[PDB]
Write a protein that binds this ligand. Structure first.
Ligand SMILES: C[C@H](O)CNC(=O)Nc1ccccc1
Ligand SMILES: C[C@H](O)CNC(=O)Nc1ccccc1
Ligand SMILES: [Zn+2]
Ligand SMILES: [Zn+2]
Ligand SMILES: [Zn+2]
Ligand SMILES: [Zn+2]
Lengths: 197, 197
């Protein structure tokens, strides 16, 4: 009766947050976002996205690292796989492009746990933790992974974003503030045995 | 990049649901429930509860088995551990007392996965997927486990309950209908690779 995965957490003060050039969005609006999703679905099929959950603590209270675009939406680090790209190699690539260092030193990403799956049935905002009834051609499939951090690290944050550490209580039942994926992180993280180092 | 746990599901028509004598609640009201929780906290400390998630399919659509008390609340099979009782042996004991057969043949319970943890800070209904800030003496700790079923089985259901198979879409965003633990099962089950046998 020890069936929980054990995960090491380190203090937020163990991590250094530097800066680098802006990293711009591929779409300038919601309307362009859904147009490009339609164009690529017709050429290569369902969009495959991957996202990483990176956890720290302060004073033994766990916090998720989020990327805030100016003072607008909160995002997990991640993005779109290429056709035939492995999911885990692809999340490591995407996290190096977002938070990798100006001095070109390699981060050691450790990814060993899936923490969920979401499906977008139409070219519209709604997403579900299952394929809904009657839907045979979903337009996007997102996969979330727990990213185990090293004891210490330097991350370079694009100048147009803020890295923020959110406590779980702030996420919980806050879909209006964070949306349905980030707001359900407390439930999805409850199964881990965290060590507060 | 295959990090998901694989789980076999079988058709609901593979399972037989017989009947047996009523199984009565330990508390006759909400008021007696919170009185007994107070009395036992003073004698043996925090309540330790365990619950099982039992999954089937029909026509390749997953469903969770719930126990309905008359036409009132929906419950997971489970209940209260004794002082010093192992969590996994204790859930197997409790599920045999609820759904074990009138003819006294042994069910083969397989329990290999934790799917979450909830904490009750006071002698009151609110529960969280974390220990809230400032709380040092939580009054209850619930642990949920995924119960892998065999290809076929007979379950005896107490005459005062109905066994019902709920599709995930019915649970999703339905805390008013099911409460915060059962309503978040779709998110907590999204990480599994189900095989529809
Ligand atoms: C929310 C998206 O669908 C997937 N995640 C991302 O695109 N994440 C991201 C991208 C650029 C900078 C910072 C973060
Ligand atoms: C909801 C409770 O705190 C824990 N679970 C149960 O007590 N489950 C249960 C008990 C008796 C019959 C049927 C189901
Ligand atoms: Zn401290
Ligand atoms: Zn898919
Ligand atoms: Zn069928
Ligand atoms: Zn506890």
């Amino acid at each position: 009766s020890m069936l929980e995965r054990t995960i090491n957490l380190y203090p937020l003060t163990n991590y250094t947050f530097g800066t680098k050039e802006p990293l711009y969005e591929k779409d300038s609006s919601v309307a362009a976002r859904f147009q490009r999703m339609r164009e690529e679905f017709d050429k290569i099929g369902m969009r495959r996205t991957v996202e990483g959950v990176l956890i720290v603590h302060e004073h033994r209270l766990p916090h998720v690292l989020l990327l805030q675009l100016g003072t607008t939406f909160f995002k997990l680090p991640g993005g779109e796989l290429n056709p035939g790209e492995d999911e885990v190699e692809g999340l490591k690539r995407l996290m190096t492009e977002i938070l990798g260092r100006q001095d070109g030193v390699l981060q050691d990403w450790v990814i060993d746990d899936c923490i969920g799956n979401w499906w977008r049935p139409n070219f519209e905002p709604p997403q579900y933790p299952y394929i809904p009834a009657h839907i045979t051609k979903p337009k996007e499939h997102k996969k979330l992974f727990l990213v185990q951090l090293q004891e210490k690290a330097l991350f370079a944050v694009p100048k147009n974003y803020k890295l923020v550490a959110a406590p779980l209580f702030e996420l919980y039942d806050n879909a209006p503030g964070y949306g349905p994926i980030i707001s359900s992180l407390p439930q999805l993280l409850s199964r881990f045995n965290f060590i507060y180092n």
